[PDB]
Structure formats: C-alpha cells, structure tokens
Write an enzyme that holds these catalytic residues in place. Structure first.
Site, PDB file in Angstrom:
ATOM      1  N   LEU A   1       0.818  -1.203   0.000  1.00 32.66           N
ATOM      2  CA  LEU A   1       0.000   0.000   0.000  1.00 32.66           C
ATOM      3  C   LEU A   1       0.859   1.263   0.000  1.00 32.66           C
ATOM      4  O   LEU A   1       0.957   1.980   1.002  1.00 32.66           O
ATOM      5  CB  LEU A   1      -0.981  -0.008   1.173  1.00 32.66           C
ATOM      6  CG  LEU A   1      -2.023  -1.127   1.134  1.00 32.66           C
ATOM      7  CD1 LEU A   1      -3.089  -0.892   2.192  1.00 32.66           C
ATOM      8  CD2 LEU A   1      -2.663  -1.218  -0.252  1.00 32.66           C
ATOM      9  N   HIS A   2       1.487   1.520  -1.142  1.00 31.75           N
ATOM     10  CA  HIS A   2       2.318   2.700  -1.328  1.00 31.75           C
ATOM     11  C   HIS A   2       2.089   3.273  -2.716  1.00 31.75           C
ATOM     12  O   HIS A   2       1.619   2.571  -3.606  1.00 31.75           O
ATOM     13  CB  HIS A   2       3.793   2.335  -1.156  1.00 31.75           C
ATOM     14  CG  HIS A   2       4.158   1.962   0.245  1.00 31.75           C
ATOM     15  ND1 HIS A   2       4.086   0.669   0.713  1.00 31.75           N
ATOM     16  CD2 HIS A   2       4.595   2.713   1.285  1.00 31.75           C
ATOM     17  CE1 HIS A   2       4.460   0.637   1.981  1.00 31.75           C
ATOM     18  NE2 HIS A   2       4.770   1.867   2.352  1.00 31.75           N
TER      19      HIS A   2
END
Length: 87
Positions: free
Chosen positions: A14-15
């Site tokens: 989740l970046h």
C-alpha cells in the site's frame, strides 16, 4: 460492521499508486472504513494513515467498515487488492 482478512499481493504494497487508488476507492463509500495491521488501525480514507501503517507485499491486513454501504465498500477494496489494483 463488515470485516475481511486479506493478503496484499502487489510489489508496492500500500504505497504510491495503489495507496492512492486504495484511498480513492475507500473514499467512494459513505461508511467509516479501517485498515489494520498487527494491532495498528487506521482510517482507510487517510493517506497519512495508510502510510503510517507500512503495508508491504505479502502483508495480511484486516479491512473493516461500518455504514449504510459497509458490505460493498469492503467488497470494492477486496476486489481492488485481488486484481492487484487493475493489473
């Protein structure tokens, strides 16, 4: 309340793009939505929170939601994750 446990599959976790899309997708729904990893919980509509959480590839997270659309909010996120964010 609706909750699901799911593994993050994509390289980036989740970046960057996925994180932006994640918050984007969560933000489509009226429910309050949360993302939890190892006892830390954040608002899924908060990019700072997502960042703080430090979710990388292979991490298993718990998604939760409470609101009039909680079930389909979670489903939308599950689908986004399983498709590797549209890959």
């Amino acid at each position: 309340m609706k909750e699901v446990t799911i593994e993050i599959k994509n390289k980036t976790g989740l970046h960057a793009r996925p994180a932006a899309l994640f918050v984007q997708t969560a933000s489509k729904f009226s429910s309050q939505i949360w993302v939890e990893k190892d006892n830390k919980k954040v608002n899924a509509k908060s990019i700072m929170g997502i960042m703080s959480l430090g979710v990388s590839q292979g991490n298993v997270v718990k998604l939760s939601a409470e609101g009039d659309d909680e079930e389909e909010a979670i489903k939308a996120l599950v689908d986004l994750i399983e498709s590797k964010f549209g890959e």
